Design a protein around this ligand. Structure first.
Ligand SMILES: O=c1ccn([C@@H]2O[C@H](COP(=O)(O)OP(=O)(O)OP(=O)(O)O)[C@@H](O)[C@H]2O)c(=O)[nH]1
Lengths: 146, 123, 300, 139
């Protein structure tokens, strides 16, 4: 409400509200596991260092990809986003449970670290006439892909 | 007559508390006069004292309910407005019935604070 | 219905207006909360400046005998919505119009008001972006331009707003006589019994070298300008908070008057439409006529 | 806040208009005349009701033995038709009306308002508020 001028200041509640209001943009329905995990990540501050424009791309990599496996760094034993059958375990056991809480935080921390290190770093270094267009198209595609 | 006078006094204090609340927004409580800083302390106690734990919620909330008598309420508010209970902590009026409950809660809060301070001194 | 929604659109606009104006109050309150500090730290820099320039002279002999340009430097705010500060300053300047008057106003509103009002007398104005704190350099910029506007000026006046309290903003005046007239008065205060309070101060300046005196004159003139702009800013923010509250309440009264006309309109619209339908229903019932009843009337 | 004569009397008039029960013609007109002539200028706004009550349901001059009026004593309800007949500005009822008003104003300012202005104890403040509430509801 005070953001109509005055150069709204980015407190943590605002730093997380913007991500939440950007995760709500979707075209197709989301599987429960994918949605609940993404909301939890934004709730605990794993997206504070992620720009609002790249949130959808960050979510897409988390869901349809696995950075830890890509770089040979994943250490979790069972908690991987490609295991679509974890949805019912999450439904029975909340994410804030010792069974899943430990591995969930590890995966989110690892995925966040890899994303900032590899992808967002290159995004902020885009200076060209065609790369910018390719990045823009990629972001739009990810907006309606998850 | 006592009931009417007390009720009007409470309403007047609450109305004044609203204007004072807005004044401090532009100033800060430290600026307000000491009459308007005693009136901003009594009002907050009143707002906390108008809450009450209901016996219907003795199960799902866990707190014993209260049924405050009419005369007890009038006397309790009349004493509070005068300033007799200006030493009791603000939170002692939260979710309590009558004036005796306020005193009991204040004593328990004081005892708990003393025990915590005593434990801290040990370590 | 369009007529009903016309009010709804009208009330829709007033709602956004209230939000934006409320946002303005938030900005000014922050600036006023941080500009409230000067109230603590003022009223002590200008002590010997009083002796240098404090001369309660008559208001007629000062302007009647003007043989050289009288330069005025009114202080005005860049943005409007301040209140009556600019209007009063214009009244204070209009009351002193003369042949030798030259104007070097400060702020866009002063420029806009005086460029239209006094095109020929107006030479040019100074504008400061309210981004940094009012500092000495800005005052030195005001003075240097003032001299270049009229170096052979009988006096340079600054007309600003003094913030007495949150709700009191008076108009204050710093009159600065040019070097020649100042050193002449400083010479009389030294020798003569007249101007006792300035006797010691004047003799303590005549002992020193001239360049020091000229530097002293410019330095204290800058301080007076610095005080005026600093006060005029504090009066500005205080006034805007008062004015903005007035606008909020005016925009709230309109919201309560256009809502009633919108709730009165929907009630009338429902009643009229229903009345029309029933009138048509009664017309088609009236035009209908019952025919002869073809029953065994005898069989009864 | 500039308070001229019209502003003071207007505020007193507004306070007097506060009523709960209908007022007898003599009591109401007398109080209005007193306020109109500036006798209540020194009386604080919050004490107008108490001042009026003392004038109708009490008599300070008789209490403190400084009254010499022959007929215009406010306990004489029979005077209402005499006032209705002639006026409150008639020479017959003007001199005594002024005298009793001046004595009542002087006594009230000397005894009651002076004490009411020197109350700081919380208990006394509560008693004063209760008194003002009672007076406002009763003349
Ligand atoms: O040839 C001269 C003579 C005098 N002066 C200047 O005239 C002034 C006379 O100054 P004073 O006579 O009042 O005192 P002082 O000698 O103790 O001064 P300080 O050195 O302590 O400041 C001093 O400020 C001196 O420098 C010159 O600059 N040049």
């Amino acid at each position: 409400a005070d953001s109509v001028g005055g150069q709204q200041v980015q407190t943590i509640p605002m730093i997380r509200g913007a991500r939440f209001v950007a995760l709500f943009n979707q075209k197709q329905p989301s599987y429960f596991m994918n949605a609940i995990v993404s909301l939890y990540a934004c709730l605990n501050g794993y997206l504070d260092d992620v720009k609002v424009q790249y949130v959808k791309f960050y979510e897409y990599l988390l869901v349809h990809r696995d950075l830890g496996i890509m770089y040979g760094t994943a250490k979790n034993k069972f908690f991987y986003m490609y295991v679509q059958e974890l949805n019912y375990l999450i439904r029975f056991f909340t994410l804030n449970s010792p069974i899943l809480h430990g591995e969930l935080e590890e995966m989110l921390k690892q995925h966040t670290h890899l994303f900032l290190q590899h992808y967002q770093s290159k995004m902020n270094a885009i200076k060209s006439e065609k790369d910018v267009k390719a990045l823009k198209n990629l972001l739009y595609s990810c907006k309606r892909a998850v | 007559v006592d009931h009417y006078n007390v009720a009007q006094d409470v309403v007047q204090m609450l109305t004044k508390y609203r204007e004072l609340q807005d004044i401090i927004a532009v100033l800060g409580i430290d600026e307000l006069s000491e009459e308007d800083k005693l009136i901003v302390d009594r009002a907050r106690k009143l707002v906390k004292f108008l809450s009450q734990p209901f016996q219907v919620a003795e199960v799902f909330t866990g707190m014993t309910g209260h049924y405050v008598q009419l005369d007890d309420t009038i006397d309790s508010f009349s004493g509070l407005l005068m300033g007799t209970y200006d030493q009791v902590p603000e939170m002692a009026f939260y979710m309590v019935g009558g004036i005796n409950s306020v005193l009991e809660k204040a004593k328990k809060m004081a005892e708990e604070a003393a025990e915590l301070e005593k434990m801290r001194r040990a370590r | 219905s369009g007529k009903l929604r016309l009010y709804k659109e009208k009330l829709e606009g007033y709602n956004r207006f209230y939000s934006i104006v409320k946002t303005i109050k938030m900005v000014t309150l922050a600036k006023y909360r941080a500009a409230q500090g000067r109230i603590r730290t003022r009223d002590f820099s200008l002590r010997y400046t009083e002796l240098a320039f404090s001369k309660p002279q008559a208001s007629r002999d000062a302007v009647v005998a003007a043989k050289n340009a009288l330069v005025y430097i009114p202080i005005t705010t860049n943005r409007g919505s301040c209140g009556a500060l600019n209007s009063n300053i214009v009244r204070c300047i209009d009351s002193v119009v003369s042949s030798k008057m030259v104007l070097m106003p400060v702020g866009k509103r002063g420029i806009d008001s005086f460029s239209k009002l006094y095109p020929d007398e107006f030479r040019y104005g100074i504008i400061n972006d309210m981004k940094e704190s009012m500092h000495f350099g800005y005052a030195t910029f005001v003075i240097e331009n003032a001299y270049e506007v009229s170096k052979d000026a009988d006096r340079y006046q600054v007309i600003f707003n003094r913030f007495v309290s949150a709700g009191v903003q008076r108009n204050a005046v710093y009159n600065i006589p040019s070097y020649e007239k100042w050193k002449e008065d400083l010479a009389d205060a030294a020798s003569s019994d007249n101007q006792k309070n300035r006797y010691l101060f004047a003799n303590a300046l005549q002992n020193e070298e001239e360049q020091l005196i000229r530097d002293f004159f410019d330095f204290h003139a800058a301080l007076a300008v610095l005080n005026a702009v600093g006060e005029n800013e504090l009066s500005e923010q205080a006034a805007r908070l008062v004015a903005v509250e007035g606008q909020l309440t005016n925009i709230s009264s309109l919201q309560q008057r256009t809502s009633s006309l919108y709730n009165k309109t929907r009630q009338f619209g429902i009643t009229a439409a229903l009345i029309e339908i029933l009138s048509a229903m009664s017309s088609l019932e009236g035009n209908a006529m019952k025919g002869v009843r073809r029953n065994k009337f005898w069989e009864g």
